[PDB]
């Protein structure tokens, strides 16, 4: 599953 802190400017939603 993807790590959401690799780029915190991405909201996965």
């Amino acid at each position: 599953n993807p790590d959401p802190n690799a780029n915190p400017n991405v909201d996965p939603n």
Epitope: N1, P2, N5, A6, N7, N9, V10, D11, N13
Partner: antibody, heavy 121, light 114 residues
Framework: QVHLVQSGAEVKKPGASVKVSCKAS????????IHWVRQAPGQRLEWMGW????????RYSQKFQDRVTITRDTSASTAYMELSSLRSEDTAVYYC??????????????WGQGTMVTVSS | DIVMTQSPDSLAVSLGERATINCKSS????????????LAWYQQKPGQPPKLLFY???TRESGVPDRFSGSGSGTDFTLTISSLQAEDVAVYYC?????????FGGGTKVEIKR
């Protein structure tokens, strides 16, 4: 217009240190993270790390963890990358970038003009 | 370290011809919970910073002409320029933001046969 303006290119002797700066405008500086990316000669792009412009939390690549410090200044809306104990293999263009701002609100991607750092005696 | 492999490394076609650029992700970068691939495509002309073209593999950025499209999922992705124009001579980079460290493909140089 969102602009990332980056300090001028620099010559540095090996072992010394370089502090390149990234001035933000055109966007809420404290809401997004400033990434730093190296483009070494002929080689590919390399992510170095990011700092979050509100709370200042950083995360660093494992290639630069020990020699780079990224800091920000909320007042001047300016993020800074400092590389220390410079090697002649650090000669590259260094970029700051709001990498892939994909928020439910807005979507953009802005890079500064690059700062070329040459390490030489 | 998710390696991104671009094929070809250099392609040259005549004006108007279709250029296809393939990018392999070394790890599957689709997330089955939100049905998104975490890939971007960039364009870089000499002496200039890269310029985003696509996010979530297929989503075009504002400004990018419609001859550019992006497709792919899982481990295999594609950038297509349906009718190459002079402005498109550049180097193109794929890029993933699935995991840390953020990484980037090797690049594909695009030339025009004239």
């Amino acid at each position: 217009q969102v602009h990332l303006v980056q300090s001028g290119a620099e010559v540095k002797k090996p072992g010394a240190s370089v502090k390149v700066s990234c001035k933000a405008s055109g966007y809420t500086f404290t809401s997004y993270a400033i990434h730093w990316v190296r483009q070494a000669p002929g080689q590919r792009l390399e992510w170095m790390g990011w700092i979050k412009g509100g709370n200042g939390n950083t995360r660093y690549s494992q290639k630069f963890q020990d020699r780079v410090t990224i800091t920000r200044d909320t007042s001047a809306s300016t993020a800074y990358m400092e590389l220390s104990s410079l090697r002649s293999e650090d000669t590259a263009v260094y970029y700051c970038a709001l990498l892939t701002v994909i928020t439910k609100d807005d979507a953009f991607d802005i890079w500064g003009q690059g700062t070329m750092v040459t390490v030489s005696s | 370290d998710i390696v991104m492999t671009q094929s070809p490394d250099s392609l040259a076609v005549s004006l108007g011809e279709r250029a296809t650029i393939n990018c392999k992700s070394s790890q599957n970068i689709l997330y089955s919970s939100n049905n998104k691939n975490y890939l971007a495509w960039y364009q870089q002309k000499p002496g200039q910073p890269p310029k985003l073209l696509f996010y979530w593999a297929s989503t075009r950025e504002s400004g990018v002409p419609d001859r550019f499209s992006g497709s792919g999922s899982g481990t295999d992705f594609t950038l297509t320029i349906s009718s190459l124009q002079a402005e498109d001579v550049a180097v193109y980079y794929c890029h993933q933001y699935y995991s840390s460290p953020l990484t980037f493909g090797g690049g594909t140089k695009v030339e025009i046969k004239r």
